[PDB]
Amino acid sequence: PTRRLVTIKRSGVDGPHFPLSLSTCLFGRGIECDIRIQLPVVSKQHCKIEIHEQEAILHNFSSTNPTQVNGSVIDEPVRLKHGDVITIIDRSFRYENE
Amino acid sequence: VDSQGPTPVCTPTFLERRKSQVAELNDDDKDDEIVFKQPI
Structure with a gap:
């Protein structure tokens, strides 16, 4: 994959990365979402x-x-x-192109 | 909360709780609150 996404933690330290291999990346509570967050907000x-x-x-x-x-x-x-x-509330994702 | 319920706007209370929560947490954060649908 050329496009890579890095997860930012509330503490400000990067953890697991998510490769945008799929042509569509959807963030949210919905399961159908490529990235799901268990936050009610x-x-x-x-x-x-x-x-x-x-x-x-x-x-x-x-x-x-x-x-x-x-x-x-x-x-x-x-x-x-x-x-x-x-940047999402207290969480952000760094976008890296190739 | 169900992925099909309400969506309250994030407010000063919510942000403060998270900051406090981080202080109450530790390297254990590793299992934050983000889940990857596709393989990584």
Whole structure:
């Protein structure tokens, strides 16, 4: 896989990594989600990523708690760039491109 | 909480509890609260 995602812990230490091998990565409480979090403050889809030969696009489905990127909310769709970090409440995922 | 229940917005109380919880936790965090659907 070219795209790799690293999990950030509440303590600020990186742990297990998630390879975005699949063309779609969905974060949330829903099981159908590629990444599931057992937090009651997490939306069913929270964040959705779509990977196109062109580039990687992150969609914000969290209407209750918007996803933050580079320390900023993404009310609208945003193209992912190598080095861009997705931040969820107290948890964030570092995006690495190849 | 069911993956099909309510979704309360994260507030100052929730964030403070997590920070406290981290202090109450240790290297045992290893088993945080994130689950990977696909293999890693």
